[PDB]
Amino acid sequence: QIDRLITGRLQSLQTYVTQQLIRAAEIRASANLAATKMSECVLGQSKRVDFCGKGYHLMSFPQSAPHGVVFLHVTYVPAQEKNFTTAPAICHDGKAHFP
Amino acid sequence: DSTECSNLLLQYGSFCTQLNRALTGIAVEQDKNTQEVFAQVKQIYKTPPIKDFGGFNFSQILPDPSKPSKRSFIEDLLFNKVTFNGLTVLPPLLTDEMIAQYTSALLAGTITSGWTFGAGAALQIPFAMQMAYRFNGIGVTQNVLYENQKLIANQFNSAIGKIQDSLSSTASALGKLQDVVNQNAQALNTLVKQLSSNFGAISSVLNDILSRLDKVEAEVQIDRLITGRLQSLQTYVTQQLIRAAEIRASANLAATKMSECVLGQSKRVDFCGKGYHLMSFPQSAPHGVVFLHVTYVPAQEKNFTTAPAICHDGKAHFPREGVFVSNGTHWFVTQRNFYEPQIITTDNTFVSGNCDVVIGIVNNTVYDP
Amino acid sequence: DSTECSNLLLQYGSFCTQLNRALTGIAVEQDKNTQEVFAQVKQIYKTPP
Amino acid sequence: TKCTLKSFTVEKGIYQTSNFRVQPTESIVRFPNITNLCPFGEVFNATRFASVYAWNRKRISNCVADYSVLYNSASFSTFKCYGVSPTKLNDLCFTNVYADSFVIRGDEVRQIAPGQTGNIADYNYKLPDDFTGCVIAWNSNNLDSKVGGNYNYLYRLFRKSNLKPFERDISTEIYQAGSTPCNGVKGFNCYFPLQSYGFQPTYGVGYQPYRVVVLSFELLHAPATVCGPKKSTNLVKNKCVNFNFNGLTGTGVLTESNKKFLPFQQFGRDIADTTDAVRDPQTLEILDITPCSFGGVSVITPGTNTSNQVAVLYQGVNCTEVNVFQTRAGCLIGAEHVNNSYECDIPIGAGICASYQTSQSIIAYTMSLGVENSVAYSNNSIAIPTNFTISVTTEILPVSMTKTSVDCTMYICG
Amino acid sequence: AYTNSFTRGVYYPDKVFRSSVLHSTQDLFLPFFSNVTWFHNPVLPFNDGVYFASTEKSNIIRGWIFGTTLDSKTQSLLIVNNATNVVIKVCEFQFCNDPFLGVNCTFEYVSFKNLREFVFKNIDGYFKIYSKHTPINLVRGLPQGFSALEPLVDLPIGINITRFQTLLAAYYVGYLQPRTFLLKYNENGTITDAVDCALDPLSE
Ligand SMILES: *[C@@H]1O[C@H](CO)[C@@H](O)[C@H](O)[C@H]1NC(C)=O
Ligand SMILES: *[C@@H]1O[C@H](CO)[C@@H](O)[C@H](O)[C@H]1NC(C)=O
Ligand SMILES: *[C@@H]1O[C@H](CO)[C@@H](O)[C@H](O)[C@H]1NC(C)=O
Ligand SMILES: *[C@@H]1O[C@H](CO)[C@@H](O)[C@H](O)[C@H]1NC(C)=O
Ligand SMILES: *[C@@H]1O[C@H](CO)[C@@H](O)[C@H](O)[C@H]1NC(C)=O
Ligand SMILES: *[C@@H]1O[C@H](CO)[C@@H](O)[C@H](O)[C@H]1NC(C)=O
Ligand SMILES: *[C@@H]1O[C@H](CO)[C@@H](O)[C@H](O)[C@H]1NC(C)=O
Ligand SMILES: *[C@@H]1O[C@H](CO)[C@@H](O)[C@H](O)[C@H]1NC(C)=O
Ligand SMILES: *[C@@H]1O[C@H](CO)[C@@H](O)[C@H](O)[C@H]1NC(C)=O
Ligand SMILES: *[C@@H]1O[C@H](CO)[C@@H](O)[C@H](O)[C@H]1NC(C)=O
Ligand SMILES: *[C@@H]1O[C@H](CO)[C@@H](O)[C@H](O)[C@H]1NC(C)=O
Ligand SMILES: *[C@@H]1O[C@H](CO)[C@@H](O)[C@H](O)[C@H]1NC(C)=O
16 A cells, blocks of 8 residues: 555655756756846947847946845936938038048 | 446546646646746837838738638638547647747737837837847848848848748648647557557457456456556656756746747847847747748958058057958958948057057058048 | 557557657757757868978 | 635735536447347247257357347246346346356246256256356247147156266166166166156146246457447537447547548547547547636635625636636626726736726726837937936845754654 | 558548648557558468458459467357458358359348558457548559548447458458557548658657
């Protein structure tokens, strides 16, 4: 009789450890991402569009949290605008100029 | 649904429940991935009727408004090339027609509006000027694009034509996506096939066992089949968890390629495919995404003699924005990644100390404007 | 190499098939990783003297 | 849903709770056409039956045997079964059966039961105590009894030893009833072992002749060839049912099909063994089997702190078989469809989402993909920003699981 | 007298329709390119199971016998096509030891330009006869073009078989072995090609 209980319990525990391994592989990937976000968004300024928050990244502040990290990304976003006439170049006398 | 088995399955408790939670986890990740790649834009941009794009003929990569569901021509090739006990095959949260709107909007922003439609409100800009900025991104002075604009457009349209032929003439470019469907169809077919297997039991027909035997013998035989079928499911779901973690690694890569390689000009060498990066366009495909990376690759070159500085009034001069070069008869300054010779001048250079420190410096006239 | 055992192993069906297959999947991916890291460059640039 | 989530409170969302599956509305049963009946007219309406010492034997095989007509045959003065019920026989199967049959005086029917003694059992046809089979007899005075006596009906009165179970013995050799040398001729102490009933019409109802059949059943190493006749039903189409075809049990929506089987082929299999089609065994149409309609049941809800109205999706199930609305995700019930197509509050599938809205109800709709924008692009012109805003954006990442550890021996064995 | 089988001797392994699939099974088969005996005669062993074929445009080849002895001492198969149809009996026979023309019993039943063929096996006690008739234009040797044999009868008769012989225009005999095989069905559920997985590395 007990060999059935051992079989069942043991198969359940193997299933549980398999779940925790696959979950831990996600959390390792999440940690690699977070560590990169720390190194790039805090110890510097990432030029990578929408890696550090949304819009052009200025800096970010990490704040500690249970089992994780919260970033506060600080970003610059243009917010009001005008239309204009434009040209790729201006000709002066004979010669072309570029900005 | 055979009742004797339905009774005996209650011996195992949570297993035959928790597999539906596990597979629900898999299910949500698919729409999470699909959202986190394609939904990286706040508004559904749509393109005006005009085609004044400096001769860039995007007609193949834009939606055809007549198409049965609004794919581009090239999305349609990709759609064409990629090819029951207890099973359910759930819908995606988003339809193929919805995905075509997202791959339209991103591309419409990318065509009309620089990087801005990723970073804030989309701001319209003339397309030649967008390529001129992207050339400035790889370190080429923006005039060099405008001075070749027709030739570049003719190269680009030719390259787009070659993409159509590459995708049409062989399926071998799409191998990844077909492989992903093939793995799932294989796994499901083997999962079904295991129902015919016997697991040391008298039979794999369930109601046959119930017809042949003493209730007690049948319970032993059925517990074997339950044990086999259970271990089969735990095997299959183990594969689908591992496989979904893999496809999500691909999804976070894709989500990065959207934000960095479409919405911007991420400089990272050999991130946006081979060559110095200019821009890239997404196109939708079954279960996946296809990037058309557009990249500058230098292709004819000449040798020059070079000196790391020049000496003039006994002051060392260094090139301000480039490198010094010669054919022996004179000296010119040039930009680092494209041949564009210029007269050496006080404003094309900067001063730093006396000449005597610099190894390999050469004596020459700085013209002062 | 027991035939008596092998017959029983065949009654359990495609487990033995897919376990060889999955490990082949692992094994091929090791060569793939090695080409993905090292084989980025198509020309063997020899050292200058 | 509360019962599924093991909680008295439930948050806004969707939850799969259970399985929906259309029930087997009835059972269909099919067997080969009405054929190959065993020759029992020649066993019960036949013109004569043997003197019991030389009892008639016939192999019964390769045929269905109806026992119901026999247990219905009220003209049987005797009809009995041993080891088995007579009602069960039309389900049973055997390699062979034998029609072990004869005439006797009705009185000696007392000997025609399992393991019994007396002249007929012991000296003509021995019934074992273990007899798994049936005895049949009927009065035959009008055929087998005659004016002045019918002496042709014989039985072994005398034998030196008993017959073995279902042995036969013709042997006419003179019974030596003492030390007297008989040498195979009749006389004092030298009796004919066979003796005559001499049936006369004056005989009482038990002394009168009876015709008799004993049904010797036989299952052996060779497969069954005698069976009780199977029963086919009518065949319903296009409705989910339990079914059997011969030995092919199953369950599904049986339909007609276009399929061109080879004449010998009986049933189809799909891509991966599953039985997809069948030949009918009585008029040889090929029928598809199609799956009996099933799918998950899921409950769509606002937060229970906010409302107790709920809606249900039957995952992939068409509304026809289950307010009501059809979707590519299956039938949606209790929700209210609307054209105005907002962003997703709760996701369903196939572009469809639901939310709790104004008197408030669960609405359901094709989702918005966000607001459309025809950008005023033209290669003459650009827009440049005159003013800007700082924004602050939260992003959250997990970094550690709860560090968990188990003593596997304590968990397993306590 | 040896000759070779090439591609002959495949038969529908069960009464099952399969829709254009490349299905596979393990059963008794004639191994591809195995040797076979050739004839225009002795009594023969049955081994695991027998394949027979002939160029018989005339039906002068007419019958077969099977059993352990295949004579007198136990119930033994006699098979003869009487030109009306195939006739079968199973007696402990005392019939003619060599039937020809100048130019206990227990059961019975009744059913170059051309080639006619059969495969005989018993499983569990049930006895199978698979069959084919086909046009040909071949002079000698077995036809290498592919085709399948089809069931006639499936008899509950239960007899032990270890020997056999034929009764009576070229003919051939070969023996089955347990082999894993591949079978190519078409859009009509006929078998149309096959592979002996044990033949060679490409076959594997
Ligand atoms: C730019 O000009 C066009 C044409 O008058 C107009 O449709 C568009 O709304 C203008 N956009 C802005 C931001 O003023
Ligand atoms: C450049 O100079 C080297 C050495 O003289 C020579 O091998 C090479 O062919 C020249 N041309 C180019 C384009 O490399
Ligand atoms: C290249 O050679 C030509 C011809 O001698 C000369 O005009 C030119 O100035 C030379 N340029 C340099 C930088 O050596
Ligand atoms: C360049 O190489 C030559 C080889 O003879 C050597 O003499 C010279 O000093 C080197 N020049 C520099 C700038 O290193
Ligand atoms: C540069 O000019 C000075 C002038 O005094 C001379 O001494 C020196 O040798 C020259 N060097 C080279 C590399 O031409
Ligand atoms: C036998 O006779 C009875 C009437 O005596 C008749 O009903 C029955 O059909 C006949 N046949 C059989 C096989 O019983
Ligand atoms: C079955 O028997 C019935 C009634 O005699 C007849 O209508 C039908 O055609 C038969 N079918 C077959 C396949 O024998
Ligand atoms: C829904 O079910 C009914 C009954 O089977 C059918 O007539 C109808 O065509 C079905 N509609 C869809 C879209 O499946
Ligand atoms: C595109 O630019 C050319 C040259 O500036 C101009 O003639 C044409 O009107 C422009 N069209 C649009 C729609 O901007
Ligand atoms: C820019 O926007 C802010 C919003 O608070 C406003 O106070 C400020 O006056 C604006 N400046 C200009 C130059 O538009
Ligand atoms: C097969 O037959 C050939 C002639 O057809 C013969 O030489 C050979 O010995 C036979 N046996 C084997 C094992 O090849
Ligand atoms: C398949 O079936 C169709 C319809 O009966 C028939 O026309 C066709 O000739 C068949 N083809 C083959 C290859 O048997």
